[PDB]
Amino acid sequence: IVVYTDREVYGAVGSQVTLHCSFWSSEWVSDDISFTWRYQPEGGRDAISIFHYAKGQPYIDEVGTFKERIQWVGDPSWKDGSIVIHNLDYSDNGTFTCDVKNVGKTSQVTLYVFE
Amino acid sequence: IVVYTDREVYGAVGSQVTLHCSFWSSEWVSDDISFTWRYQPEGGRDAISIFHYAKGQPYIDEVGTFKERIQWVGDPSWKDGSIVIHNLDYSDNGTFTCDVKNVGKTSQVTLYVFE
């Protein structure tokens, strides 16, 4: 029924930040759910997939902007699909969108890095 | 309040197809609205922007899969943001998403080309 993320998140260069994603429903829902995370850099319009989870298996992208900087920290049993973005860089600014499916429901969070 | 698109569209190779997008609201809404079209090929997870409209000006991508094959046919005055995909090819299969803003509201349509 509803997907949750933070509205904005601030991070320091060389530090890490966690991007929360979870979903809730008033009725029972099985653990056969998928989570997909997409990234759009500040001032761009393309949304690139950086992480995917389904049938109990996680898939991390090894080719893009956050390659070697993504950690899966969610739990499907708890309807949680959160990830951590590591070793922040100035150029990381942008909007991240979490897409939940059982067509999905999405929610976004914008990142700003300072220091 | 609501964004409309068709669920699926079928097209013949070497032919054209129109991708409808429109929005409606029970209350008055100004013509300061934007339309953005993104494309995800069949079996992929990346959504690439192929067209954008804002402040009365249309922007067509000249670098991607549908370069030289997009025509703007909408009217902002009528809350219509439709486009035509020209000279269809077998590989065009995929999902198109229309994003309407005044964070937006989205709706998608899936394309299948035969013959």
Blueprint of the fold:
Two copies of one chain form a homodimer.
Chain A: E1 2-4, E2 8-12, E3 17-19, E4 22-24, E5 34-41, E6 48-54, E7 57-60, E8 70-72, E9 83-85, E10 94-101, E11 105-114
Parallel strand pairs in A: 2-11
Antiparallel strand pairs in A: 1-4, 3-9, 5-6, 5-10, 6-7, 8-9, 10-11
Verbal overview:
2 copies of one chain form a homodimer. Chain A is an all-beta fold and 115 residues long. The first copy, chain A, has a single domain (1-115), classed as Immunoglobulins (Immunoglobulin-like). In chain A, 0% of the residues lie in helices and 50% in strands. Chain A is globular and about 45 Å long. It is classed as structural protein.
Short description:
It is classed as structural protein. The structure is a homodimer of 115-residue chains. Chain A is 0% helix and 50% strand.
Number of domains of chain A: 1
Helix/strand order of chain A, N-terminal first: EEEEEEEEEEE
Work out the strand percent of chain A.
over 45%
Distance between the termini of chain A: 38 Å
Number of helices of chain A: 0
Largest sheet of chain A: 6 strands, mixed
Rg over alpha carbons of chain A: 14 Å
Oligomer: homodimer
Q: Approximately how much helix is present in the residues of chain A?
A: under 10%
Function (chains A, B): Is an adhesion molecule necessary for normal myelination in the peripheral nervous system. It mediates adhesion between adjacent myelin wraps and ultimately drives myelin compaction.
Disulfide bonds (chains A, B): 21-98
Family (chains A, B): Belongs to the myelin P0 protein family.
Protein name (chains A, B): Myelin protein P0
